[PDB]
């Protein structure tokens, strides 16, 4: 019913849909993250391979080549405002 609950439940489901494919089941490898971006996010359709690699590098803050839920949340936070500007004009 609640549109908030549905969106939040979705972002949790989406994270684990890709994170549980290889290695640590609760972190995103470069491979897992790239699939997530390209298949689920609007911003990823226009991005090229070099751009996605640069993006993934800036999402991994502690440089363990993995993206945890926290690193993933702040990503969505940025995305919310980036999308917000685009929806203006």
């Amino acid at each position: 019913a609640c549109p908030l609950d549905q969106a939040i439940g979705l972002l949790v489901a989406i994270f684990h849909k890709y994170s549980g494919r290889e290695g640590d089941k609760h972190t995103l490898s470069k491979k897992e993250l790239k699939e997530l971006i390209q298949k689920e996010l609007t911003i990823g359709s226009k991005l090229q391979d070099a751009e996605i690699a640069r993006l993934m590098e800036d999402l991994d803050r502690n440089k363990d080549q993995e993206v945890n839920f926290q690193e993933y949340v702040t990503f969505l936070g940025a995305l919310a405002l980036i999308y917000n500007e685009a929806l203006k004009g």
Partner: protein, 302 residues
């Protein structure tokens, strides 16, 4: 009743009035008490240097003075006084003491809960209370009642003999239902048994709820995910048996095993209309009935 209930804070001074007693000598008053220290009825002499002179002393105005009240000072205090007129006046006090603990904490709290199974949300801890008091939980701004739903609590109380103060622990266990709140918010509160007091509340925590996809014994994955592809190209069928080190995987098209050797993968290149149909893989095993994966429909779009 006749006895007046007195509630004093541990470590703080307390004064008990001997009602109807002259401010100045001569006075005809006597204090009788029975506390945890005495374990008996004792007369408390007004003279200095008495047996209890470090704990309780009679003031010049007849009032009883305890400079730093303790748990052992709990008990009955009675003064009997004659006014100068003079009629006998009695003062009967029942003294109980208390201490307020520091703000309760939630320790070892979970960032992520797993739906469908019990989870330890965390353990609320309270240190330094008297009397014990109680710990309770809040969920989404409302009181969380135990043993309903799949919510359970493991409680324990421990007394420190060194001070007589209590340590409380409340371990919250919940089983999130599938399709429930993706971000439940919990908090814990301490309710003093004495005195009547506003509850001491922890900062809230907001764990997330992860709903695991149902795990199949035989897991089939098709790229592309949809199972629909333009004319030509390639569709790859991969299927896996997590509980078996060396699975024997036989591929099937529309419920019929394909004339192929056992293989974990099946690639269908140059897809024509003849290649359309329901696909699945079967894991066979010695001494065990075969298991089938989910059925995938493969089609073609124009």
């Amino acid at each position: 009743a006749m006895a007046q209930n007195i509630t004093a804070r541990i470590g703080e001074p307390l004064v008990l009035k001997c009602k109807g007693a002259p401010k100045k000598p001569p006075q005809r008053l006597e204090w009788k008490l029975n506390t945890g220290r005495t374990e008996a009825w004792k007369v408390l002499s007004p003279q200095g240097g008495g047996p209890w002179d470090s704990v309780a002393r009679v003031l010049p105005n007849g009032s009883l003075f305890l400079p730093a009240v303790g748990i052992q000072d709990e008990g009955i205090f009675r003064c009997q006084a004659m006014n100068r007129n003079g009629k006998e006046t009695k003062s009967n006090y029942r003294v109980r003491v208390y201490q307020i603990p520091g703000k309760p904490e939630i320790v070892d709290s979970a960032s992520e809960l797993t739906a469908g199974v019990p989870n330890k949300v965390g353990t609320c801890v309270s240190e330094g209370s008297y009397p014990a008091g109680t710990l309770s939980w809040h969920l989404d701004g409302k009181p969380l009642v135990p043993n309903e739903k799949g919510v359970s609590v493991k409680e324990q109380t421990r007394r420190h003999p060194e001070t007589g103060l209590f340590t409380l622990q409340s371990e919250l266990m919940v089983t999130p239902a599938r399709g429930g709140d993706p971000r439940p918010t919990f908090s814990c509160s301490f309710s003093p048994g004495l005195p009547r007091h506003r509850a001491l509340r922890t900062a809230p925590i907001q764990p997330r709820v992860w709903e695991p996809v149902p795990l199949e014994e035989v897991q089939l994955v098709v790229e592309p995910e949809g199972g629909a592809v333009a004319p030509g190209g390639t569709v790859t069928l991969t299927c896996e048996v997590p509980a078996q080190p060396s699975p024997q995987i036989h591929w099937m098209k529309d419920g019929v095993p394909l004339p192929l050797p056992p293989s974990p993968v099946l690639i269908l290149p140059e897809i024509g209309p003849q290649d359309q149909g329901t696909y699945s893989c079967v894991a066979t095993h010695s001494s065990h009935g075969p298991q089938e994966s989910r059925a995938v429909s493969i089609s073609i779009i124009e």
